[PDB]
């Protein structure tokens, strides 16, 4: 298992330590996602100098509350944070 594979597993692991808490073990409510993002990306968020980017991380987490967040939807948010984090390494 490479360092890259350990990071992928690590990201899955973080999703799961939230998703297992309530409801279906493999999804999150939008409320739980929002808590996850606010805490687990707190620095990434502080350092992002274009707030469109913040808004984009949080887009739609205050409506369609009946619809749950699966890992696929989480991957999309990870992709956004991975761009933000790259960019920050060049600041």
Q: Is 32 annotated for ligand binding?
A: yes
Report the alpha-carbon distance of residue 14 to residue 46 in Å, rounded: 20
Residue 54 to residues 9, 15, 46, 49, 84: CA-CA distances in angstroms? 25, 19, 9, 9, 10
Per CB under 5 A, 6 contacts Zn ion: no
Out of 49, 64, 89, 91, the residue judged to bind a copy of itself by CB under 8 A: 89
Cβ proximity to Na ion: between 23 and 60 the closer is 23
Residue 20, CB half-sphere, CA atoms under 13 Å: how many?
Answer: 6
29 part of the interface to a copy of itself, by CB under 8 A: no
Contacting positions for a copy of itself (CB under 8 A):
1-12, 14-16, 26, 39-44, 71-72, 75-76, 78-79, 81-83, 85-86, 89-90
């Amino acid at each position: 298992s490479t360092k890259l594979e350990e990071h992928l597993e690590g990201i899955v692991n973080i999703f799961h330590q939230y998703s297992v808490r309530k409801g279906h073990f493999d999804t999150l409510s939008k409320g739980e996602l929002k808590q996850l993002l606010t805490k687990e990306l707190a620095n990434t968020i502080k350092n992002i100098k274009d707030k469109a980017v913040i808004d984009e991380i949080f887009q739609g987490l205050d409506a369609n509350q009946d619809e749950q967040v699966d890992f696929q939807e989480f991957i999309s948010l990870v992709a956004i944070a991975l761009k933000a984090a790259h960019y920050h390494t060049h600041k």
